[PDB]
Symmetry: C5
Subunit: 307 residues, 5 copies
């Protein structure tokens, strides 16, 4: 089995797509292995760029195809080069930009943590092995972060392993395992923007909704309720059109639903107070003054959104 060592340089992780559970990675891949020594002009190692590589392959040079297992679509590869040493070293180097897939749980939004992973297997050869993996994510830890969407826990962790393909015929009858490199990079979301521009105002609006009980008239209370209703709707719209699309509810989504519920409960009480009596317009004294029952009865059912 040929020993292949790869180093992966990661230049940029960007463009997360919540719906597709993908993210873009720009970087270089280097792969090295040793073969039969070779005669090279002078006795300096030889450099072969781009279109020239295929020529060498036609005349017999072995350059194994390494696949990104979890890439979605053919990656965009830029320049590639072979460095051919006379003593038989062969070093493959290429620039790449790809869309990579992973399981991504966005349920604890603004405060979610994800891992960006790369998975590398040789495409055709079970009979050749990854000797070691080195990722150089030489961005940086504590620096520009409040300029960036994602904060890296860093540096990346690696794992060479063996994957069994049971339904894939192979060269020999016994050997059906592939060598796989797996790189993982952990990251937390920069929750600032969403706290200050979404969660805060949502709170303010929800709170202010409670000030309905400090209105004197029943007519005033009920009528104003419908305007608070409209406000939550506008806010849900705003919230939904600007936040990332998902197939499930986030914490912000729940707050919105709570807002709706509070305002509906209010409309129930407000109407109840006015007709739970013994005359016509005897608003239930104590009740119409649950100007403290709601706010904290909601901060109770609001501390069970975190259980």
């Amino acid at each position: 089995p040929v020993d292949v060592s790869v180093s992966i340089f990661i230049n940029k992780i960007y463009g997360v797509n919540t719906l597709e559970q993908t993210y873009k990675v720009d970087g270089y891949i280097v792969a090295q292995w040793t073969g039969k020594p070779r005669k090279t002009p002078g006795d300096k190692p030889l450099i072969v760029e781009n279109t020239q590589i295929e020529r060498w392959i036609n005349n017999g040079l072995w350059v194994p195809a390494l696949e990104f297992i979890n890439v979605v679509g053919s990656p965009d590869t830029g320049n590639k080069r072979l460095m051919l040493f006379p003593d038989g070293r062969v070093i493959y180097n290429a620039r790449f930009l790809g869309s990579f897939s992973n399981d991504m749980d966005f349920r604890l939004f603004p405060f979610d943590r994800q891992q960006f992973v790369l998975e590398l297997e040789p495409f055709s050869y079970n009979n050749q092995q990854l000797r070691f993996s080195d990722i150089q994510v030489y961005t940086e830890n504590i620096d520009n972060e409040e300029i960036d969407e994602w904060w890296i826990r860093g540096k990346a962790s690696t794992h060479i392993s063996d994957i069994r393909y049971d339904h894939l015929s192979s060269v020999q009858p016994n050997q059906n395992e592939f060598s796989r490199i797996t790189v993982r990079i952990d990251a937390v979301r920069n929750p600032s923007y969403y706290l200050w521009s979404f969660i805060l105002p949502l709170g303010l609006i929800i709170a202010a909704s409670w000030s309905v009980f400090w209105l004197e008239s029943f007519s005033e209370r009920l009528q104003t309720s419908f305007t608070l209703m409209l406000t939550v709707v506008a806010y849900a719209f705003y919230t939904s059109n600007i936040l990332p699309r998902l197939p499930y509810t986030t914490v912000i989504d729940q707050m919105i639903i709570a807002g709706y519920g509070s305002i509906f409960a209010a409309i129930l009480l407000i109407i109840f107070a006015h007709h739970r009596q013994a005359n016509g317009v005897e608003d239930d004294l104590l009740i119409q003054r649950c100007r403290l029952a709601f706010p904290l009865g909601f901060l109770a059912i609001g501390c069970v959104l975190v259980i």
Copy 2:
């Protein structure tokens, strides 16, 4: 006729497009057939990757083109390889990502079920036949699902058949049938998000609209109606800009229309009560108090949205 057996590995089904009735599929395809025995270096089977395959084809190697019948646009193929055994086996393997078409009925939205299908025929050869089909959809059944938009029934069903092309001249005068593989994967939509973030609040807002009848003044009742009207409009906007585009109405779309209707009927009654009398401001006693006629007269016409 040459016997070709194919296995399809499905990695990912994503990116449904409701308007185009398409969906994206990432996977591998493997196709095997036996030909004339061959001399191979050593006597180990031979591996041929990517650009090298065309070379073998020019020197006479037969590699039939298999077409995805229901793909929309040329699929993006990654690496491909031929594995050439000395005893004449030939195995073709390629990575692919394509947009596939199928008839898709989204009428019973949030609760719709679809089938993602693949259809494979040889492009030029009627005179070669699919021996068997195996799909390995080794994602998984009951696991991550609430993380995913679609839930798979699984595993996929297969079916080799013969398709007659009556208006397509062929090699011989009699033979105009093509061998076709058809893969089907069933799936139900994860209805959670839409229940809690759309259907529920729509309900609340529709209900609350009913509380118009508990207002004392006619002036209060009619004027408030126009605000409920605006609310349903905002809600329709929100609902439309965020839900999948379709050429027909979904259940949610109907709820919205009901909301509009209820609010219009109300404005009719409210105005009727005020002028069906014998004076000037004698609001029809019994009627203005259909605070229960509407809510259940609507839950009646609301159980005929399901007949």
Copy 3:
């Protein structure tokens, strides 16, 4: 002049773009012509796929380039094949997906009818002629239609003709005409969704706007007017963001404008009634009760939106 007969199979028409006046078509093209008889392995006709075709062309095979006149950008062609008969028949077959252009009048929206056309000319040869055209639009007529956005009149009509290029130098000094095939498919839009989800509610909202005249106070009437105003704006927004972009007004656009007009006229009257008198608050009796003048004076100016 060489006789070429072409058949066009149409798999899918989709993705209309109103602004660009384009639409996408997926299908196969087949083109047949006879040349000098040929020696073929065995004496069976010979099949040549994809990359192999250019090889045959380099060695002298004539394969005329047929251009889609009204395609916008290079079409995406999938597999292509030549079938070479020993008696000299040559059949070219290719899968294609392309964006096609045509004049498209969307003025009578939801109820518009369009024709999807293809136009085929040889690219370089005036000196070769289309013998006949067959389109197999074997979708189907009355079937799935309420699942589809467009309903086909069907089947397609065809048209071979000759086009004169006066400013294009040609092989000989006299001959400057090209053989053109033109396929036409008629289609009507599925107007359901827009009737029930846009036109209907617009109507309700417009009607409800009229109920402003059944308000007792002048203050009540004028103030409520501004809310109806806001409602039409919200509705216009909703309508515009969701309906297809056009450089002109559709029927729905006009309804919206009417809505605006009605509500402005009402604000004029409402203010007039209050100051066309002889005191201070003597609302012109008869006028403030044009609760029937408007509704039908609008259904009059609403039956001149169709003259």
Copy 4:
């Protein structure tokens, strides 16, 4: 210097992008020049299509590369052909679709006029010259225009000239000028849609805002103002989300700002009237009745939006 004459056929101008100041053009380019006479099969001129052209170039055929100076990105070229006459004429013909750039001033929106230009220079040869330019924009003038977004002044103007590249080393030490063709097509925007669907209603809404002064109470006047405020905001949103993005204000943008200003001035007056007196609720008689001061004081400051 070789004399090259080019004709450009323009099929379609579409897809203007206001932000990028680009537009799409689909057409054919033809370029003709004479070289050394040649032996051709028969003695008929010879036709060479697509992949075959490169072959001729390898064997020595000269085909100069003509660059679209103001294209943004590599244009999409369809079929291309060489027509080789035995007397040495050589005619190059290719289909093209490209994104072209020009300075574009959208300041006088709905009523802006633009020019769509093409600029052609040889890529490498200063030492070869454009003899003449003919554009065949055989669309048409007064015909379908209300179906189209842009109206062409027509026909296009042309202008061969010489461009000096001072910082570009050339074949000889003296010669650093390139032959450039420049095509210009003038066009005016079809202002209908924007007049009837944006400018008109904006007017109505602005006018109606003035009817605030015909309200009896101060409370009524101030409170209603805030609703007019909200309306202008909704309208700005609607206007912005639907109109073309620009880095500057259009006339419509200014109207919107005026609307905002009028409504703010009103709020100032309304509050002033109520407290510029000598008691408590003595609304300044004359002032509260500037129901004509505003409307025309605005049509004054509204005729200085056009100075």
Copy 5:
């Protein structure tokens, strides 16, 4: 080491993407170096365009690959040419359009300044060196700017340097440095549109919100507050849907939040005044008349948004 001098002509900088921190650049690159003298037809330098270049490379011509370090994805290259002088000069020239990345701080929005940078390194050769850099950004300084989104300081600055790659094996054991050209162009954003169309109206709206304190009734003051609330929400939506997406708050974003806060504080006061007394409806005289406390207490906390 081979001396390579490059000139970069910049035609267009456009398409900034705030989320990705990228921008598009269209231009030409020219690279020159001297090699072994050569026999050329006549003794005029020789021009080699496009596909022909690879041919010369197969026959031994050395054309080093220059990589844009900070491009994102393979740039779109148009025409390329080699100019081969007989005395051994070699000049490579290519048109390019690429998406480039840089650190981009948009925190001080409408008034941010950015630098558009290019970074060039040889892809494989450490053993070859950039002798000098010239950028010809011959757009222009003070001219069309109010037509353009970005205003260039100009002209660009350059800087050849040496970059150490510690984890990249090289030709010789010692030499692991690459020659890198860095071009920088400074630019300020055209803040007009955002001042007049966003910041201004936001101000007006915020100010008008203060006029709530000039309402007579408590009921009037509280109820009107909820409409001002809704207005800020609509405005936030409008602002968010139209302004560039970012992972952090801009100045505009902060104004919005202030608006929310002012309105909430008002609701607190308004309710406080009404219940900080000694009866039932004794609105705290002095307080309810903080019609000047707020406006300047906000212009105070509004001059600490700039500390």
